[PDB]
Design a binder for this molecule. Structure first.
Ligand code: NA
Length: 284
């Protein structure tokens, strides 16, 4: 089951605050996915969500309004719900009020909205044809909940989207999601790693101390060999490595390697051999 539909399942039995909030949520369904025909007295809803379809049926039941037909129009296939038109449906001003607006948002989201699995993306969207509706919705999201949302063009439709995981949680909780807010936080909190600047400094020092102690140990090993047997009496490939280290004592192993067409690991293996040889003569 998609993460999005799991969120929508939580909303199927959210309370019906009042008749006004019920009609406001229905208007959300109507605006997003309703093909309205006042003359023939019907509304055709096209829904890709079963959670959304069940919520729509529960709203119509609350209002005591009959739904006449439920069919699948033959992934791209969708649910067609035909219901009776009532002028009361269109009388509500859904933005005027945070209670009315939250119900409108729930309707918009259930019918035409979706949300990405936050393990992969931060994305919650609402698809809508009308341009005014989307702008007004975006303004009310900001005024009421301080939620910043962008807008996207798709020719067939336009998308309102929220990319802040903070704003997404506020949005979801506002419309009545509960269980899944905990799962989202466990995912968000688990991607995080916080702080210690002193731990960072400690780590950087430790690596620098390792590198310095190694380099000193290389130099010391080369000096002992030079004193006791002569570098000229090393195997040719170790001899060049000993000289390059001794002549370039502040270079990294990578940079020492470049001077002999050797990789860092190659020059490092040779330095280890040189140190092994120098144990003969003294502490290294
Ligand atoms: Na050199």
């Amino acid at each position: 089951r998609t993460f999005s539909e799991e969120i929508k399942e939580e909303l199927v039995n959210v309370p019906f605050g009042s008749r006004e909030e019920v009609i406001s949520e229905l208007l959300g369904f109507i605006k997003a996915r309703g093909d309205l025909d006042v003359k023939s007295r019907h509304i055709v809803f096209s829904l890709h969500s079963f959670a959304a379809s069940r919520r729509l049926l529960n709203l119509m039941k609350y209002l005591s309004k009959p739904v006449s037909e439920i069919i699948v129009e033959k992934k791209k296939r969708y649910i067609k719900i035909t219901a009776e038109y009532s002028e009361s449906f269109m009388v509500i001003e859904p933005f005027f009020d945070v209670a009315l607006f939250v119900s409108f948002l729930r309707g918009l989201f259930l019918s035409g909205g979706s949300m990405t699995n936050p393990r992969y993306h931060y994305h919650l969207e609402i698809n809508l044809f009308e341009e005014e509706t989307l702008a007004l919705t975006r303004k009310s999201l900001k005024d009421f909940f301080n939620i910043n949302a962008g807008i996207i063009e798709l020719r067939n439709t336009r998308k309102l989207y929220i990319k802040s995981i903070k704003d997404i949680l506020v949005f979801l909780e506002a419309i009545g999601v509960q269980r899944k807010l905990e799962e989202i936080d466990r995912i968000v909190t688990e991607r995080k790693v916080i702080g210690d600047v002193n731990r960072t400094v400690n780590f950087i020092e430790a690596n620098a101390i390792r590198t310095a102690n190694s380099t000193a140990r290389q130099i010391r090993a080369i000096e002992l060999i030079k004193e006791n047997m002569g570098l000229e009496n090393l195997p040719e490939d170790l001899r060049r490595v000993a000289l390059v280290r001794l002549r370039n004592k502040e270079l990294s192993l990578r940079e020492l390697g470049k001077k002999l067409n050797l990789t860092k690991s190659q020059i490092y293996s040779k330095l280890k051999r040189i140190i092994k040889i120098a144990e003969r003569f003294g502490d290294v």
